[PDB]
Amino acid sequence: VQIVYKPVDLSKVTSKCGSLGNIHHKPGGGQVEVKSEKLDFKDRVQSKIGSLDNITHVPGGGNKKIETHKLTF
Amino acid sequence: VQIVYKPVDLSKVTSKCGSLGNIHHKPGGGQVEVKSEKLDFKDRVQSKIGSLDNITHVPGGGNKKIETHKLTF
Amino acid sequence: VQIVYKPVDLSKVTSKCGSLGNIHHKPGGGQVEVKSEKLDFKDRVQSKIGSLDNITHVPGGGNKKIETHKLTF
Amino acid sequence: VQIVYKPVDLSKVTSKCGSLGNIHHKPGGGQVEVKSEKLDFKDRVQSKIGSLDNITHVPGGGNKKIETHKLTF
Amino acid sequence: VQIVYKPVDLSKVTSKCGSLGNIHHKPGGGQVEVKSEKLDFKDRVQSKIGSLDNITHVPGGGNKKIETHKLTF
Amino acid sequence: VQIVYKPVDLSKVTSKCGSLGNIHHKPGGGQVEVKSEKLDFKDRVQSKIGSLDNITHVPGGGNKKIETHKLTF
Numbered sequence: 001v002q003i004v005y006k007p008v009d010l011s012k013v014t015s016k017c018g019s020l021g022n023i024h025h026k027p028g029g030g031q032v033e034v035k036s037e038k039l040d041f042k043d044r045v046q047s048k049i050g051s052l053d054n055i056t057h058v059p060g061g062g063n064k065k066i067e068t069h070k071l072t073f
Numbered sequence: 074v075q076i077v078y079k080p081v082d083l084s085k086v087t088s089k090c091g092s093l094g095n096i097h098h099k100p101g102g103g104q105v106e107v108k109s110e111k112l113d114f115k116d117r118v119q120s121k122i123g124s125l126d127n128i129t130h131v132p133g134g135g136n137k138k139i140e141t142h143k144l145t146f
Numbered sequence: 147v148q149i150v151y152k153p154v155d156l157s158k159v160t161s162k163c164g165s166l167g168n169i170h171h172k173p174g175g176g177q178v179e180v181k182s183e184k185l186d187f188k189d190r191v192q193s194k195i196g197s198l199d200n201i202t203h204v205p206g207g208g209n210k211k212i213e214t215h216k217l218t219f
Numbered sequence: 220v221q222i223v224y225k226p227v228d229l230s231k232v233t234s235k236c237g238s239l240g241n242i243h244h245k246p247g248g249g250q251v252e253v254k255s256e257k258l259d260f261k262d263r264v265q266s267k268i269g270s271l272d273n274i275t276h277v278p279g280g281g282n283k284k285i286e287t288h289k290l291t292f
Numbered sequence: 293v294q295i296v297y298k299p300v301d302l303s304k305v306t307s308k309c310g311s312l313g314n315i316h317h318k319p320g321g322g323q324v325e326v327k328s329e330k331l332d333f334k335d336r337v338q339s340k341i342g343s344l345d346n347i348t349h350v351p352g353g354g355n356k357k358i359e360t361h362k363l364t365f
Numbered sequence: 366v367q368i369v370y371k372p373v374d375l376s377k378v379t380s381k382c383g384s385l386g387n388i389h390h391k392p393g394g395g396q397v398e399v400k401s402e403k404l405d406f407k408d409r410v411q412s413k414i415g416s417l418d419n420i421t422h423v424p425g426g427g428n429k430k431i432e433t434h435k436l437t438f
Binding site: 220221222223224225226227228229230231232233234235236237238239240241242243244245246247248249250251252253254255256257258259260261262263264265266267268269270271272273274275276277278279280281282283284285286287288289290291292 | 293294295296297298299300301302303304305306307308309310311312313314315316317318319320321322323324325326327328329330331332333334335336337338339340341342343344345346347348349350351352353354355356357358359360361362363364365
């Protein structure tokens with residue numbers, strides 16, 4: 001048995017951008033109010049209040065090449 | 074048995090952009106109010122209140138090449 | 147048995163844009179009010195209140211090439 | 220000649236308010252763009268551009284009593 | 293000749309307010325852009341650009357009593 | 366001739382306020398851009414650019430009593 005796995009990639013993933021800028025992300029500019037009275041909890045509580053886990057991501061490229069090779073005999 | 078696997082890729086993924094900008098994301102500019110009274114929870118509670126997990130993503134390219142090559146005998 | 151898997155790809159995925167901009171996303175500009183009284187929960191509670199998981203995605207390209215090659219003997 | 224100018228004022232101007240609040244004034248939230256080319260002015264120019272002279276006035280009373288007394292012989 | 297000018301004021305100008313608050317004034321949140329080319333001015337120029345002369349006025353009373361008493365012989 | 370100018374004022378101007386607070390004034394949160402090319406001015410120029418002369422005034426009273434008395438013979 002002869003297996004010849006010889007794939008060729010000569011590709012390019014390219015971007016050209018001018019000025020990249022004047023980006024505004026303002027999550028949670030509004031007032032947040034939480035009032036709790038006379039609550040019973042009999043198991044685990046998880047609570048997140050306010051402005052959490054928000055992302056601003058501005059890469060000058062941000063191009064991705066993903067390439068998977070598998071050979072199984 | 075002879076198996077020859079020679080895929081050739083010469084492809085291009087390309088963008089050309091002028092100025093990229095003047096982008097505004099303002100999630101949750103509105104007031105958030107939560108009032109709780111006399112609640113009972115007999116099992117697990119998860120709570121998120123406010124402005125959470127919001128994304129601003131402004132890549133100057135953001136091009137993707139996704140490629141997969143499987144040979145199984 | 148002879149198998150010759152030799153596909154050729156010369157393709158291009160291309161964009162040209164002028165200025166890309168003046169983009170506004172304002173989810174949840176309106177007031178959110180939640181009042182809860184005298185509620186019983188006997189099993190798990192998940193709660194999201196406000197402005198969550200909103201996305202502004204503005205790629206200068208955003209072109210995708212997706213390509214799967216499989217050979218099974 | 221006898222003049223007896225004897226007006227009596229016992230009046231009240233009264234206000235009762237609960238909570239006064241949650242007031243939003245956002246004038247000129249929109250983008251303003253002015254382009255001028257090749258203009259000739261042979262007399263005085265006055266120019267206002269943007270967000271000018273806006274008022275938010277929130278008096279807890281704001282009651283007015285205005286009272287003029289005149290006697291001319 | 294007898295002139296008696298004996299006006300009596302026993303009046304009240306009153307306000308009662310609860311909490312006064314949660315007041316937002318955001319004049320000129322929008323982008324302002326001014327481009328001028330090749331302009332001639334042969335007389336005086338006055339220019340205001342941006343966010344000017346805006347007022348937030350929140351008096352806990354703000355009650356006015358305005359009173360005038362003129363006698364002329 | 367007898368003139369008897371004897372005006373009586375026993376009046377009051379009053380406010381009672383709860384908490385006075387949570388006041389936000391944000392004039393000129395937006396970007397200001399001014400570009401000038403090849404301009405001629407042959408008389409006086411006055412220029413204001415940006416965030417000027419904005420007022421936040423939050424008096425716990427702010428009540429005014431204004432009272433004018435004139436007698437002319």
